[PDB]
């Protein structure tokens with residue numbers, strides 16, 4: 077009976093790093109989590125079917141386009157749970173033109189059946205500051221207000237995921253320099 | 268079924284207007300939706316049963332089966348949608364005296380399944396102020412701390428709806444004097 | 459219809475005394491709702507098994523063991539509600555090292571089928587003093603910010619519950635020295 081952890085965040089919050097750096101310290105101790113990336117789940121199956129041209133042209137497609145390739149990673153990742161403790165790096169909601177789209181709607185929530193959901197946070201100002209220094213990608217650097225509104229809906233969604241699955245919801249805080257503090261807490265929650 | 272859109276917001280925030288005005292402009296575009304005030308769609312159930320008269324003793328009505336009424340109206344709109352894209356002017360939660368009442372309960376929610384939920388928001392001060400100008404209704408005059416509260420719990424409903432039904436949650440701001448901007452927001456989300 | 463009322467408030471807020479007082483008055487005027495305390499109930503399930511020596515340290519167990527016990531207690535009360543209306547005393551979310559474990563997952567909400575979910579609230583300054591002036595316990599005395607984060611997620615928990623069960627979500631304030639505003643406002647919705 078293995079453990080599925082969901083690590084959610086707004087872009088540029090550092091969900092991924094904190095996760096990766098968390099499993100590495102764990103690997104050496106005994107606990108070999110997976111590093112699935114729920115977004116890339118659907119991008120191994122996307123250029124493969126001609127909907128994007130990279131990993132930043134997927135949330136500029138229509139609602140009916142993404143919501144097919146979702147319920148598929150849903151059990152495809154669930155499969156991987158019949159092998160090892162998973163850590164599904166995903167998004168509580170998704171910023172799109174149509175509005176906040178749930179990153180794990182009920183049908184994906186049953187398929188995955190999480191034991192813990194985690195909402196990595198920080199200020200919009202710090203998030204924004206981080207979005208700029210990351211040469212590795214393109215960030216909206218939108219206003220603080222939109223960050224907070226997102227981070228607000230991310231909580232109400234995270235909590236519903238906990239209601240529906242019984243998953244406990246952890247809120248990790250991740251400050252500049254203090255990223256070590258987010259790992260270790262993601263660790264006490266992972267162990 | 269088809270494309271179904273639910274448009275919500277506390278009394279006074281002007282969600283009804285934003286909806287009519289959009290579908291006025293939409294009707295001249297050769298695409299045709301459907302105004303439906305969930306409120307009166309369920310008034311037809313009222314007198315046909317003689318349970319209360321007013322459209323007031325229905326959030327103030329005997330709480331057994333306020334839900335009965337609520338239930339039926341929600342699947343009546345159901346078929347109203349296979350036929351045409353629908354737009355449902357309603358509320359996320361209804362501030363009855365037993366607390367907030369979820370406009371779209373689990374059942375009605377499934378019995379409808381919108382592809383979009385829309386949350387219309389503005390300051391308590393302005394909401395309050397529009398209520399003074401709504402002479403069309405026998406309005407109440409509540410505090411702002413409590414308007415803000417209700418808009419809180421609304422967003423939460425609204426997001427629990429999204430998850431349960433894969434629908435996108437859009438928060439559309441509708442400030443004083445700027446009716447048309449929210450109209451443009453509603454619309455480009457309907458397309 | 460037999461009436462299941464749920465009442466929640468972070469530890470320290472006064473959910474218990476609120477419901478206590480609310481019933482004396484009700485019991486000395488006809489309806490004694492059954493006074494039932496979710497944690498008292500499930501403690502009795504744990505001590506008997508040895509998993510807990512004190513009621514206090516059950517939330518420091520593992521989530522999954524907490525959910526087990528929790529589920530047994532949810533169905534102990536379910537049979538309690540076949541034969542008398544029950545104001546059940548519980549929590550929107552429990553605070554654990556692994557985050558906010560819900561207080562009524564979907565399967566538990568199904569069990570009780572509450573009609574009203576009530577949230578008791580107040581400032582985290584006021585609560586922190588209630589926690590110090592309470593001999594009957596051994597409180598851990600946490601940060602203000604951590605109380606509002608819990609009281610936040612509580613609201614989204616308790617809102618989730620409304621959308622699933624169709625219960626009404628009543629929010630109720632218990633300030634210092636004003637213990638009897640809560641009692642009376644509870645009854646007013648309790649009867």
Ligand SMILES: Nc1ncnc2c1ncn2[C@@H]1O[C@H](COP(=O)(O)OP(=O)(O)OP(=O)(O)OP(=O)(O)OP(=O)(O)OC[C@H]2O[C@@H](n3cnc4c(N)ncnc43)[C@H](O)[C@@H]2O)[C@@H](O)[C@H]1O
Nearest residue numbers: 087088089090091092093114115135166167179206210253
């Ligand atoms: N389940 C779902 N359903 C439907 N669609 C889904 C979905 N899940 C994903 N998608 C789709 O997938 C696409 C991809 O998502 P998108 O958000 O665009 O990229 P991502 O794969 O999800 O990664 P992030 O954007 O979240 O970057 P990150 O900050 O979280 O991680 P990291 O810390 O390593 O990023 C680098 C950051 O590290 C942080 N960092 C690095 N060094 C430091 C430091 N020294 N101090 C503090 N922070 C640091 C910085 O903030 C830096 O920016 C989206 O279009 C989305 O629509």
Ligand SMILES: Nc1ncnc2c1ncn2[C@@H]1O[C@H](COP(=O)(O)OP(=O)(O)OP(=O)(O)OP(=O)(O)OP(=O)(O)OC[C@H]2O[C@@H](n3cnc4c(N)ncnc43)[C@H](O)[C@@H]2O)[C@@H](O)[C@H]1O
Nearest residue numbers: 278279280281282283284305306326357370397442443444
């Ligand atoms: N889901 C469901 N379940 C259970 N019950 C349900 C239900 N759905 C509905 N009901 C029931 O239906 C009943 C009421 O019907 P319903 O119409 O659904 O709710 P309501 O309380 O009566 O809503 P209002 O008409 O008062 O507010 P509004 O913002 O929609 O009105 P308007 O667009 O005119 O805006 C207000 C005024 O401000 C003006 N205004 C001024 N400036 C602006 C501007 N800047 N933008 C927009 N409007 C402006 C507008 O012109 C207008 O005059 C309730 O009892 C409720 O129980």
Ligand SMILES: Nc1ncnc2c1ncn2[C@@H]1O[C@H](COP(=O)(O)OP(=O)(O)OP(=O)(O)OP(=O)(O)OP(=O)(O)OC[C@H]2O[C@@H](n3cnc4c(N)ncnc43)[C@H](O)[C@@H]2O)[C@@H](O)[C@H]1O
Nearest residue numbers: 469470471472473474475497517528561592633634635637
């Ligand atoms: N659904 C679920 N799922 C999984 N686990 C669950 C669960 N539900 C419960 N649990 C578990 O069960 C346990 C729950 O224990 P629980 O039953 O919840 O604790 P308790 O013994 O009742 O006391 P609390 O710590 O809960 O404080 P309270 O404020 O709620 O009650 P009170 O008003 O009397 O506090 C009284 C004190 O506050 C003060 N006070 C009250 N009102 C006022 C007033 N207005 N002015 C001044 N002081 C006041 C007085 O000083 C008094 O001393 C947890 O460990 C958890 O594991």
